[PDB]
Design a binder for this molecule. Sequence first.
Ligand SMILES: CC1=C(/C=C/C(C)=C/C=C/C(C)=C/CO)C(C)(C)CCC1
Length: 175
Amino acid sequence: ERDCRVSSFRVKENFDKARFAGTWYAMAKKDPEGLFLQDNIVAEFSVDENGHMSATAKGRVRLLNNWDVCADMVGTFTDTEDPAKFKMKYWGVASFLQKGNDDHWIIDTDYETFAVQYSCRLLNLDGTCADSYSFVFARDPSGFSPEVQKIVRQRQEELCLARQYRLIPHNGYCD
Ligand SMILES: CC1=C(/C=C/C(C)=C/C=C/C(C)=C/CO)C(C)(C)CCC1
């Protein structure tokens, strides 16, 4: 029944980059394979005068060898035929942090309260995603109204990611 083909997924209608700017607290995440941000994750989005979107982000990550560090990350986004779908180039302030180029899709947002983000890093032969990640972001660090929670849950189901997220703490560690 459920179509899990990435090419089928709905994204945010008439996505507005400028209204999306500012501070976004990560409340929940679905992990990909390998090294990934762990917790204390906060993003800052910006858009310049020509419509070019970029972001910084902080979060705790534990390395190779179990070393715990505060990652300071940077991303730059390229626009596509769909206003809600981007290519994100990313790197760290420290040279040893992971660098890459990921799809970056805004699945849904009301710009003032929540956002659901998605990235498929690898397609299966059948069109479904072999390696994804997803953030649930909030403007306000706290639990979301029950009304907003219901909508977020539905979006998770539509991405074929329901029941695959974990809650993320904030306790300072990265200042
Ligand atoms: C840049 C960037 C993002 C992704 C960051 C990633 C993927 C970080 C991974 C870091 C690693 C693996 C560090 C250890 O080397 C998100 C989607 C939050 C949006 C804001 C900008």
